[PDB]
Design a protein around this nucleic acid. Structure first.
Ligand SMILES: [Zn+2]
Lengths: 154, 62, 84, 58, 50
RNA sequence: CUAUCUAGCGAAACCACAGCCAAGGGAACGGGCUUGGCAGAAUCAGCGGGGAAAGAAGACCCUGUUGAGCUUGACUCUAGU
RNA sequence: AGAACUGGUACGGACAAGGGGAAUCUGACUGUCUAAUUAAAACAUAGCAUUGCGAUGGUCAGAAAGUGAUGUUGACGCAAU
RNA sequence: GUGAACAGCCUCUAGUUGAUAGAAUAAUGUAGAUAAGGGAAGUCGGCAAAAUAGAUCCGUAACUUCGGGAUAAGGAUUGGC
RNA sequence: CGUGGAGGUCAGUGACGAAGCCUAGACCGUAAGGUCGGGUCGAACGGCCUCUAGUGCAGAUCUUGGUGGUAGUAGCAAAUAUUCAAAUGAGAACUUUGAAGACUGAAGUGGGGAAAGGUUCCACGUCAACAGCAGUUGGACGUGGGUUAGUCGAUCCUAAGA
RNA sequence: AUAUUGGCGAGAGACCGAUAGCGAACAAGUACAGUGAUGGAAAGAUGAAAAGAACUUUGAAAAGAGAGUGAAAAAGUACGUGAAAUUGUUGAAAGGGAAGGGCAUUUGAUCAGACA
C-alpha cells in the first residue's frame, strides 16, 4: 500500500489502485493524464463523453503517426483519440475512489484527483509467426494504476 | 441456456437431419431440462419440437 | 518442394518401442534396436558415447537386488533367524 | 443414485472448494510465470536455421 | 490408429493417468515446494513419441 | 480489397551519437571540423534524392609454405591379376 | 431430315470454347532430370555396329569361406561399349 | 436440370454461415474490365491482353515414310412457335 | 590504490543495527580510490604487518540474462456475407432459439474409413491463460462417464525378403 | 612392497558459493527437440511461528480501501536485501536545424569555517 509522489495530507484523501490490469500502457498514460486536476463530477462527465464520441482524449507523448481529429482542439493539441478500454478501466477506479471517499466522511462536493499515475506491469507474452519460419515475440503491455482523490480547501 | 445438445439429439430421435429441426422459441425454460434422449420423444409428441417439412425442389418446368 | 510439402508425407513409422530398453528405437525394417542391439546378446556399450554410458549405466534405476549386497556383506552373509 | 460426488472425498481430507479456488488460481498464475520466462528466452535463439537458403541469386 | 495393439493401449492408460493437476493438499504439506505439476502435458502441444 | 480515420490486438529490419545545405582542405565525393548563407515548437498523408542506408549478393585479382572434388607417362605406394 | 411462321438481324444469346499461314536451325517421335533460379537442341529410346566368353568360362562382388551376383541362365544368351 | 460430359452454372437430401470489425471512397497499389482514330509506330522480343472457338454442311494445298498433313486454309447456318 | 581467501595483531566494530544499496550532501588524495553525515536495510565485517591468487573491463560480428528507440507504427485485406427480434448474462458485430438472406451443388463445406494422433468423444461447472479482436462459447480449463463380438479384423498361410 | 577419474564406507581443504561448482544444491540425465545415433536446459532464500489477513464497504467478479496479524506488509506467496539500462508521477531548470565537454564569471539552489 505504498503510493507514488503525493503532495497532500493523507488525512483528507481516499485512495484507489488497480494492479496488473490488462489494458494498454501507452493509452492508459494518456487517459490518466487527461484527468489530472479535475473535479470528480466533470471528470466523470468527461469519461462518459469519450465513450459517447465527443471530447476526445488528447494523446500528448505516446502519439507518433496517429491520425488527427478535431476534438483535441479544446486541449490545444491536434492529435486526439478515444481509448474506450482504458476509459472503462479508469472509470471503475474513479467509482472505487468515490466509494472510499464516502467511507471517511469526505463529502463529494469538492473532490478532485490529486495523484494519478500508470506503471509498466510485468509483460504477458505470446508468440506470432512470420515468414521463413521465424518466431518473433508478441506481448501485451499491462498497467498498474494508482489514484488518490482528495478535497480542495483554501 | 444453450440448446446445442438438444438440437443435436432431435435429429437422432426423428430421422431428419440437424438443419430441419424446429425447436421452440418460447419454451426454452422447458427444452433445456430435456437432457437425455428419451425425454425428447415426450416433447415431439407434445409439439414443442416440430420436424420442418422438406423444402420443395419441384420438377414441373423440366 | 523439399521442405514443407515433403513434410506432410511423414506418417508411416520406422521405429517402434524396444523390449529391452523401452525407448522408441526398435527399427522394424531390419529388426534391431539402436540404443542397445536387441537380437544381439550384449547391450550396445560405447566409449565415445561417454555421456550415453551415464544414461543407462548401473546405479540409475531401481536396483531391486544390487542395493542389498552392500548391506548383506557387512553381516557376513549370515543366515538363521534374528534372535528370540 | 449417488451419495458420492467429486467433492465428497476432498471436503474431508484437507482442501475445501473455497480454498480449492484459492489453490487453482495460484497454479494457473504460476504456470503463466513458468511459460512466460521460457518465451523470454527461446525467441532470441530460434531463427538459427542451420541450413538456410537466402533465395536471391539472379 | 483405431486398430491399435496392446503395447500402445498399455501406455495410453498411463498417459491418461498422468494427465491431471497436482493434488491440492500437497501444497499444504510442510517442506513442500512443488507449486505446479511440471511433467503435465496435453495433446495439443507436446506429442508423446510412441 | 488495401491504403486513410476509429474500437481492440499489435511485432520486426535497423541503431556509436544524431540529422538543413554550398565551397574548402581531407583516407583523394562531410551530418559534425573551418569561413559562409541561415534558423521557431509538435506535426499527418504521400514520396524514393541522400543516410557511400538494410541484406547469410554475382563478381573479377592476389597472397597463404590453406584444404577438398577430379585427371594424367608427377613422386611414393596398394587391392586385384 | 425438311417447309411456312415471327424479331431492334437476335439466335453454342451467360456458362463453356483452337488464333491461323509460308519458311530456317536443332532433336526423329511418346517419355525423363537439375525438389527450392536452368525442361532443352541434354539424357533415354527403337534401329545399326563392335568386343569378350563354351562353363574349370565372360563380367563383378567378398576380409576370408566348402562364399556369392548374371544363373530357375548357355551365343536368336550374358556382360562391356 | 442445361449440356456429349462426373465440364462450368443453378437446385434438392446433408452441412456451414468460419476467416477481427465500423466509417470514409484521396494518392499509389493487387485483382477484374472498357474505349473514339490508327493497328506493333512500343519494346531486345506482340511480354500481357484482345481475337478465333461448340455443332451441322460445303470446302480443304505444298510435301509425304502414302499411315498423315487436317479441326489445314476459306465460306454459310443456328431461337421460338 | 583495490578484490577473493590464509597466518598474527587491534583484549577492533556490530541488533542501541554488521555488509550491500541510493544521494547535482561533505572532506582527503594530482589521481588509482579512501573517509563521514542522511534514507533504506537486517547479521555479519573491517585496519595494520605478512602470505596466496580462477583478482580489476567499454569494446572481442564477445557469452548468458534484462530492457530500449523504432511504435500504439507495419499491419490483423484469398476462399462471395451477413441481418433482425428474443433468451441467460455484469457485459453480446462473435453463445443459443426463432425468423429471413446465402453458400458448398453428389470428383461436396455431406455420410464412413486407412496411416498417424490418444481420450480431443459426451455431459456438468468455469473464463487467470489459449482461440494473434471479442467471448457467457470451444478440439482450452476441473471433475466424472464411455469402447461390450463364436461370425468384422489380427491370430492361421505364403510372396518379395528377413 | 605396486596400481585404482568405477562401486562401498569414512576423514579433511589457504578450492567454488548459484552466470561459480558436476550437465543437475530443486519431482535431473528429468522437462524438451530429433525417425535415430545422440543432443539437454532454466529453476535455491517470506517470517521466529503461517500467527497466509477474521470483519466492514464499493464492485458482477479479479481486486481496492479500511480493520487485523506481525518486531517489519519499505517481509502478503508475484514473498530477504531490490542495483542499472528502461518507465510514470510531482518538483527545479533550460531549449530559433542535434545533445554532451574545457577555461572564467554573473544569477538561482545548497554546503561552510568560528573568528563563541
Ligand atoms: Zn533397446
Amino acid at each position: 500500500a505504498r503510493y507514488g509522489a503525493t503532495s497532500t495530507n493523507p488525512a483528507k484523501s481516499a485512495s484507489a489502485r488497480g494492479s496488473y490490469l490488462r489494458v494498454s500502457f501507452k493509452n492508459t498514460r494518456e487517459t490518466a493524464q487527461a484527468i489530472n486536476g479535475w473535479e470528480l463530477t466533470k471528470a466523470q462527465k468527461y469519461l462518459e463523453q469519450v465513450l459517447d464520441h465527443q471530447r476526445a482524449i488528447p494523446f500528448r507523448r505516446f502519439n507518433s503517426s496517429i491520425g488527427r481529429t478535431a476534438q483535441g482542439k479544446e486541449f490545444g493539441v491536434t492529435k486526439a483519440r478515444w481509448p474506450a478500454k482504458s476509459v472503462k478501466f479508469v472509470q471503475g477506479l474513479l467509482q472505487n475512489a468515490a466509494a472510499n471517499a464516502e467511507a471517511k466522511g469526505l463529502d463529494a462536493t469538492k473532490l478532485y484527483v490529486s495523484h494519478i499515475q500508470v506503471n509498466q506491469a510485468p509483460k504477458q507474452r505470446r508468440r506470432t509467426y512470420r515468414a521463413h519460419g521465424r518466431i518473433n515475440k508478441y506481448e501485451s503491455s499491462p498497467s498498474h494504476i494508482e489514484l488518490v482523490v482528495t478535497e480542495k480547501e483554501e | 441456456a444453450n440448446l446445442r445438445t438438444q438440437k443435436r439429439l432431435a435429429a437422432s430421435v426423428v430421422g431428419v437431419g440437424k438443419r430441419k429441426v424446429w425447436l421452440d422459441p418460447n419454451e426454452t425454460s422447458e427444452i433445456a431440462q430435456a437432457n437425455s434422449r428419451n425425454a425428447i420423444r415426450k416433447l415431439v409428441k407434445n409439439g414443442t419440437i416440430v420436424k420442418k417439412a422438406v423444402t420443395v425442389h419441384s420438377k414441373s418446368r423440366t | 518442394g523439399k521442405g514443407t510439402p515433403s513434410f506432410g508425407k511423414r506418417h508411416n513409422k520406422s521405429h517402434t518401442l524396444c523390449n529391452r530398453c523401452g525407448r522408441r528405437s526398435f527399427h522394424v525394417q531390419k529388426k534391431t534396436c539402436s540404443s542397445c542391439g536387441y537380437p544381439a546378446a550384449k547391450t550396445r556399450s560405447y566409449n565415445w558415447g561417454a555421456k550415453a554410458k551415464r544414461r543407462h549405466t548401473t546405479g540409475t534405476g531401481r536396483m531391486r537386488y544390487l542395493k542389498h549386497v552392500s548391506r548383506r556383506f557387512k553381516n557376513g552373509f549370515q543366515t538363521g533367524s534374528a534372535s528370540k | 443414485r449417488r451419495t458420492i460426488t467429486a467433492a465428497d472425498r476432498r471436503m474431508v481430507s484437507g482442501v475445501t472448494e473455497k480454498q480449492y479456488k484459492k489453490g487453482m488460481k495460484k497454479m494457473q498464475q504460476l504456470e503463466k510465470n513458468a511459460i512466460n520466462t521460457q518465451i523470454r528466452r527461446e525467441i532470441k535463439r530460434v531463427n538459427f536455421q542451420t541450413h538456410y537458403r537466402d533465395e536471391l541469386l539472379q | 490408429a483405431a486398430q491399435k495393439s496392446f503395447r500402445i493401449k498399455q501406455k495410453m492408460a498411463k498417459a491418461k493417468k498422468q494427465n491431471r493437476p497436482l493434488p491440492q493438499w500437497i501444497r499444504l504439506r510442510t517442506n513442500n515446494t512443488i507449486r505446479y505439476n511440471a511433467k503435465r502435458r496435453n495433446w495439443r502441444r507436446t506429442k508423446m513419441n510412441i
